[PDB]
């Protein structure tokens, strides 16, 4: 795994520990999507919501998926590709989530949906890229998708589909250019 892959993991782990020590609220005051007009130009907040997780299962599986999928993108396609997928999917998934239920949300789930769509489709359309989602892992991706869809580890399905759409779109275009 490359530097973007690892720095994200470090960030999420430190933030999660901080949320346990300080409480979710205090950390959200710093990192959440802007929740007051006076914060609308704190432009990092359109992305930093992605760094907060709300349970052990939430962060554990997100970081496993991020490490595998994000790591593959970074290794084969470069840090830049990973950064763009991450920023765009975080921004769009965050935007959709906040429109539906307000600014108090967080985590990498939307980004992971984008990376799943990206790695799966790029691998299927463009095997030469060296990127692919192994069939064994497709099994677990579907389990993880269905479980989250029914809120077993709420009400964020639309935002997640928005993330998936970003990944599928980028993979499609990238496979044409490649
Ligand atoms: C070195 C260069 C660094 C540049 C870093 C800053 C770039 C981002 C600036 C902050 C973005 C705020 C967007 C916003 O919060 O704008 C919404 C505002 C209220 O409505 O006005 C709007 O909607 C306007 C239309 C939607 C946008
Ligand atoms: C606060 C929470 C923090 C959690 C963060 C976890 C995020 C993922 C960490 C993975 C780091 C692996 C990097 C590495 O250093 O690699 C390890 C090893 C290398 O081996 P190598 O030297 O041959 O290369 O191989 C492997 O990564 C094996 C990878 C497969 C791991 C599967 C774990 C499944 C756990 C299921 C739990 C379900 C509970 C219900
Ligand atoms: C909570 C419900 C949702 C569960 C979601 C689970 C998500 C797990 C994602 C892990 C991603 C990182 C894994 C990774 O990046 O690793 C890469 C490497 C692949 O192996 P390889 O390419 O060398 O070939 C294998 C040799 N072969 C082809 C002959 C078999 O190692 C591996 O993938 C090791 C495989 C990891 C399997 C872990 C399964 C844990 C499921 C527990 C929960 C079940 C619910 C009840
Ligand atoms: C948006 C979601 C990502 C866009 C790609 C969707 C997945 C995909 O891979 O779409 C494939 C299809 C392009 O066809 P092709 O290059 O596989 O075959 C070309 C025909 N030939 C084989 C005889 C040369 O793209 C299309 O549908 C292009 C239109 C997409 C509109 C989606 C509306 C919902």
Residue numbers in the entry: 93 to 245, 248 to 272
Authors' text:
Intramembrane proteases are one class of membrane proteins, which share the property of cleaving transmembrane (TM) proteins to release cytoplasmic, luminal, or extracellular domains that move to new locations where they can carry out their biological functions. Rhomboids, first discovered as part of the epidermal growth factor signalling pathway in Drosophila, are characterised by a core of six TM helices. Structures of the rhomboid protease GlpG from Escherichia coli and Haemophilus influenzae have revealed that the catalytic dyad serine and histidine forms part of a water-filled cavity separated from the external medium by a flexible loop and from the bilayer by TM helices. Substrate proteins are thought to diffuse laterally through gaps between TM helices to reach the rhomboid active site.
The second crystal form of GlpG S201T was obtained by using a lipid detergent mixture, dimyristoyl phosphatidylcholine (DMPC)/3-[(3-cholamidopropyl) dimethylammonio]-2-hydroxy-1-propanesulfonate (CHAPSO), which has a tendency to form bicelles or bilayers. These crystals belonged to the orthorhombic space group P212121 and diffracted to 1.7 Å. A comparison of this structure obtained in a lipid environment with the GlpG S201T in a detergent environment shows major differences only in the loop regions, which are reflected in their temperature factors. The displacement of His254 due to S201T substitution is much more pronounced in the structure determined in a detergent environment than in the structure determined in a lipid environment. The crystals of GlpG S201T obtained by mixing with lipids are type I membrane protein crystals, as described by Michel, which mimic a lipid bilayer. A total of 14 fully or partially ordered lipid molecules have been modelled in the current structure, and with contributions from symmetry-related lipid molecules, they form an annulus around the protein. Second, the bilayer thickness around GlpG varies across the protein, and lipid molecules adapt to match the local environment of the protein.
